[PDB]
Design a protein around this ligand. Structure first.
Ligand SMILES: [Mg+2]
Ligand SMILES: [Mg+2]
Ligand SMILES: [Mg+2]
Ligand SMILES: [Mg+2]
Ligand SMILES: [Mg+2]
Ligand SMILES: [Mg+2]
Ligand SMILES: [Mg+2]
Ligand SMILES: [Mg+2]
Ligand SMILES: [Mg+2]
Ligand SMILES: [Mg+2]
Ligand SMILES: [Mg+2]
Ligand SMILES: [Mg+2]
Ligand SMILES: [Mg+2]
Ligand SMILES: [Mg+2]
Ligand SMILES: [Mg+2]
Ligand SMILES: [Mg+2]
Ligand SMILES: [Mg+2]
Ligand SMILES: [Mg+2]
Ligand SMILES: [Mg+2]
Ligand SMILES: [Mg+2]
Ligand SMILES: [Mg+2]
Ligand SMILES: [Mg+2]
Lengths: 64, 180, 43, 151, 262
RNA sequence: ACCUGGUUGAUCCUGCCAGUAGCAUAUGCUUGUCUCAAAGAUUAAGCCAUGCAUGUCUAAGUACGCACGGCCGGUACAGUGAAACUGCGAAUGGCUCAUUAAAUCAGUUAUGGUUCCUUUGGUCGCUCGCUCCUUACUUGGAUAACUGUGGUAAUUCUAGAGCUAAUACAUGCCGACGGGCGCUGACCCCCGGGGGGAUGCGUGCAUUUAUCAGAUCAAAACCAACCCG
RNA sequence: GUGGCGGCGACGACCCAUUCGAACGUCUGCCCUAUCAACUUUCGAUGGUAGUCGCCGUGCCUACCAUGGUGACCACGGGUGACGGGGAAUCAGGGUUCGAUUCCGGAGAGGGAGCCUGAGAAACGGCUACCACAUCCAAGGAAGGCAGCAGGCGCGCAAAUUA
RNA sequence: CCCGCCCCUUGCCUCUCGGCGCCGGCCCGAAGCGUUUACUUUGAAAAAAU
């Protein structure tokens, strides 16, 4: 028994298809326009937006 | 040592089980009190919770009740005549609950003579009723009464009971006669 | 457990007369708890 | 018949039967007073228990037992032991993986009081929980109703 | 275990104590006392977590050993004393009196009471029996035993007890139409009127209650404490009057207030 | 035609191959700043040097160690206090997963079939009854610390002798006075009130056995018309 | 006057209730194996009567009686790199695979047995004997149990601080 | 073709309580009995942590 917390989570997921020209081009455009450091910064925001839009879709499955 | 647990027994279906723990203190058993007839010898036993049990090893007196006359008197114990559980206890003269014993009849005769002012045991508003069965008169002639022990000497340390009367007396007399 | 384990080895004269005082020491005496044992241990 | 079939005298413990009386009361009738009780929960004491002469310390009506706990039902399957029978309870157990059922059963040994007579194999019995009366017996028979098909 | 346990893990403590997770491994195990372990509020929790008079357990000990805190009119120096439902806590140094009453969230509330109200408490009768020499005895929910009670008092009734003398002043009978509070289950802390009672022999009775807003609910007979005769309670009530409010009707009252403003 | 590519004159079947993402075990090269968390595993629940992990005193059980100390002839004991006796705890916590398949465990129900240190609330008074005459203002026997004599290669080993305590261990009653305390009341005296009283009824449990009573049992109030006096 | 009355606390104490439990029972629910089909019953297996022991109910045990009790709705036997659960991962779902591991319950203290004290232990940082290990010795005897926290070993090959 | 108002609904003896009824048996009044469950929709009671 300890008085510590073990709660943590990951904030990004690596892409499903690693060799896609469209994905690489989109990442290049985003990183260049917003001055980001690497691909992980894009993947983090993509993870957040995926969570939000999944929640919205699940709510839209219900009655008004 | 002695254990009175359940998990050494077979199952209802007939299969056997394997233990998952060792013997526990609260499952213990202790050797019996084979209470004999003789000068009083009683030991105390410390039991679970801190209480006491009187483990009577040897007894010679007890108070018995004449129920029909409502006369409770302390009397010595003479012999053991019948035991329903086992005949070996009769042979070894062991005092247990529900065994049939022979007791002296002197205090009961004294109370009867001092109460009704009639003779009993002698050789050849409502008034008080003095009527005795023929079997009890014969026993008073012999000087010894048949009694049944109602207490557990190995647990309470004393041997009390009641004088056999009525159909119970006839039943036990028939059993004793058939045993011989 | 039919399988073979590692720790196999680790898991496989009249007495002297006594006249003691009135208080009893025989409360816990049994086969494994003997009141008196010979002074010289067997070699 | 005769109730004294054991080596010890069979007697109902709470009744004193050696009271002396005038000969006028002796001449009339030697009828012992019976002990019985109401077990509660709407179950009625059978007539033969009140009017009988059997001695049973495990009888729910004339013995020293208390009914408390669960009240169950069963079908009588075997009557071959002394004062105790074997009943069967059938049920359906549901398996979620296949979304279906299977038939299962349980066997119970229950104490039958001598007050219940003309009990056959195949009739419904209502039993109640009591203290353990033997190694495997924990329920005691409260009510008997006959099979619907057999009259 | 080979005997009684003496510790309590913090995450295994009752949830209505509102203890956090990172303060420590342990929680105060209540002492044995008038109330059960799972239905009590220890003195340390009330004195440092609810009122913030102390910062640590040592300061709670220092406060208690000055004989400042009185529970039901008697000074208690044990910091893990189990204080329960309808208990009176007095601190004369700060001029404060409290009564332990559940709120609508199922937790003991900081409920301040007038000093005249601090002289009595309500108790639920748990047992009636005849003791030695034919003297009637009454046993309440907080382990108080009282001799020579009124013959009209039966089990599940409520009595008012004067704290100074420990004697019954009057009583409320258990009947339909009386006011009651729920002391356990899902409806804990809800106040209403008894409507009818369902009896199950050899089992638990079920009682139906309706509050002031017309909502109906049901509990077991052991979870009901009669508070008042008719609709009038015999004690002061906390900020919520025992009505558990839903989100929809909270929105409704907010809309009504917004419409009435302007 | 249920991913993309391969194994046929055409259409198929059966064995197959490669690519794509993770989990576990072991292991490399690199590692400027900061926050949080983790740490098992030879079927070896195999073996362990050393140290530590459980002790505890309030005004309130027992101080004749000057061990230290104020006041003194009132002088049983000022006060602090090591040691030892007594009381309580040491059955909680921490570690591990070897055994265990209706067993453990989970939900549900029962104690009217048992025990329970503590906490909290109750309870915790005596008429007389051959113990006579002038311990209940307090009864009895011991033992540690301490002093001294010792034994052994060696341990938190202990032997003989001499003192002294109790909330340790035992025993044991209620000292004298008063109508003992309550009810119940024939008569009587005074002023609806006060009194004195012939009399009657009561005045520990716990244990073991037997018997009796226990809702065909007790206790009380209410009562029109109609009688009864 | 070996007068009569007393206030506030501490400790102790028989019993009743309360609290914290503990222990026995009720109902329902477990993985693989039928090339395990009948099992239990002398030496208790199922039930009855009386008793012993036990804190208590009970074949828990002992005498005397009956011949029962379980089973293809899978008993009984065998296996498990089988402590159980709350839970973790992955899924459209259904499920499948993990759960020694900080919460709850059980069990053990190198191995099988026994016991004292106590309200509570079959206790091991308590005791007694046996088996296996192992320390000191003047050889007579004596003392032991890290699956507590650190730390060392487990052929020569190796991973947290004796704070 | 609505809306009032009254009436019949038979029975049976497994259990229980009864009988002033007949030869242990039988008759009778009942105060006795005269369907149950699965399914579905509720309501209680059901540790935290995750
Ligand atoms: Mg533990
Ligand atoms: Mg505590
Ligand atoms: Mg091919
Ligand atoms: Mg003190
Ligand atoms: Mg000590
Ligand atoms: Mg204590
Ligand atoms: Mg202790
Ligand atoms: Mg008390
Ligand atoms: Mg003492
Ligand atoms: Mg007395
Ligand atoms: Mg018996
Ligand atoms: Mg038997
Ligand atoms: Mg295993
Ligand atoms: Mg686990
Ligand atoms: Mg253990
Ligand atoms: Mg080891
Ligand atoms: Mg103790
Ligand atoms: Mg042990
Ligand atoms: Mg150790
Ligand atoms: Mg330990
Ligand atoms: Mg270590
Ligand atoms: Mg190594």
């Amino acid at each position: 028994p300890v008085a510590r917390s073990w709660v943590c989570r990951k904030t990004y997921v690596t892409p499903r298809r690693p060799f896609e020209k469209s994905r690489l081009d989109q990442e290049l455009k985003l990183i260049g326009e917003y001055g980001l450091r690497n691909k992980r910064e894009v993947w983090r925001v993509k993870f957040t937006l995926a969570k939000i839009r999944k929640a919205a879709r699940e709510l839209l499955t219900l009655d008004e | 040592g002695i254990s009175r647990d359940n998990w050494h027994k077979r199952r209802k279906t007939g299969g056997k089980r394997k233990p998952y723990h060792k013997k526990r203190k609260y499952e213990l058993g202790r050797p019996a009190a084979n209470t004999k007839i003789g000068p009083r010898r009683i030991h105390t036993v410390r039991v679970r919770g801190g209480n006491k049990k009187y483990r009577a090893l040897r007894l010679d007196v007890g108070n018995f009740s004449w129920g029909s006359e409502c006369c409770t008197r302390k009397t010595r114990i003479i012999d053991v005549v019948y035991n329903a559980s086992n005949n070996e206890l009769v042979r070894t003269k062991t005092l247990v609950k529900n065994c049939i014993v022979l007791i002296d009849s002197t205090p009961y005769r004294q109370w009867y003579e001092s109460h009704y002012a009639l003779p009993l045991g002698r050789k050849k508003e409502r008034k008080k009723n003095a009527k005795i069965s023929s079997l009890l008169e014969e026993q008073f002639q012999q000087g010894k009464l048949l009694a049944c022990i109602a207490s557990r000497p190995g647990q309470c340390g004393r041997a009390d009971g009641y004088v056999l009367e009525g159909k119970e007396l006839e039943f036990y007399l028939r059993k004793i006669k058939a045993r011989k | 457990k039919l399988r073979r384990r590692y720790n196999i080895k680790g898991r496989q004269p009249p007495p002297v007369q006594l006249e003691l005082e009135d208080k009893d020491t025989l409360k816990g005496v049994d086969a494994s708890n003997a009141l008196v044992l010979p002074g010289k241990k067997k070699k | 018949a005769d109730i004294q079939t054991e080596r010890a005298y069979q007697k109902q413990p709470t009744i004193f039967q050696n009271k002396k009386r005038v000969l006028l009361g002796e001449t009339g009738k030697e009828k012992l007073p019976r002990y019985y009780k109401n077990i509660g929960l709407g179950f009625k004491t059978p007539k033969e228990a009140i009017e009988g002469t059997y001695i049973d310390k495990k009888c729910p009506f004339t013995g020293n037992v208390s009914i408390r706990g669960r009240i169950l039902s069963g079908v009588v399957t075997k009557m071959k032991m002394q004062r105790t029978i074997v009943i069967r309870r059938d049920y359906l157990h549901y398996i979620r993986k296949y979304n279906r059922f299977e038939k299962r059963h349980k066997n119970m040994s229950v104490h039958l009081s001598p007050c219940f007579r003309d009990v056959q194999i195949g009739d419904i019995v209502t039993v109640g929980e009591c203290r353990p009366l033997s190694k495997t017996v924990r329920f005691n028979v409260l009510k008997v109703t006959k099979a619907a098909g057999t009259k | 275990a080979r005997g009684p346990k003496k510790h309590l893990k913090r995450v295994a403590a009752p949830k209505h104590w509102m203890l956090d997770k990172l303060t420590g491994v342990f929680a105060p195990r209540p002492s044995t006392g008038p109330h059960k372990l799972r239905e009590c509020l220890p003195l340390i929790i009330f004195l440092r977590n609810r009122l913030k008079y102390a910062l640590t357990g040592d300061e709670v000990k220092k406060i208690c050993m000055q004989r400042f805190i009185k529970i039901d009119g008697k000074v208690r120096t044990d910091i893990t004393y189990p204080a329960g439902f309808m208990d009176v806590i007095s601190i004369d140094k700060t001029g404060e009196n409290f009564r332990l009453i559940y709120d609508t969230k199922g937790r003991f509330a900081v409920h301040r009471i007038t000093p005249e109200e601090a002289k009595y408490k309500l108790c639920k009768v748990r047992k009636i029996f005849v003791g030695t020499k034919g003297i009637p005895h009454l046993v309440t929910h907080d382990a108080r035993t009282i001799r020579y009670p009124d013959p009209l008092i039966k089990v599940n009734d409520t009595i008012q007890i004067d704290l100074e003398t420990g004697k019954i002043t009057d009583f409320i009978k258990f009947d339909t139409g009386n006011l009651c509070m729920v002391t356990g289950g899902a409806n804990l802390g809800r106040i209403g009127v008894i409507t009818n009672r369902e009896r199950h022999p050899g089992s638990f009775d079920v009682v139906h209650v309706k509050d002031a807003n017309g909502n109906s609910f049901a509990t077991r007979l052991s979870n009901i404490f009669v508070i008042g005769k008719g609709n009038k309670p015999w004690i002061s009530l906390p900020r919520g009057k025992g009505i558990r409010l839903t989100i929809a009707e909270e929105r409704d009252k907010r809309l009504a207030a917004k419409q009435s403003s302007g």
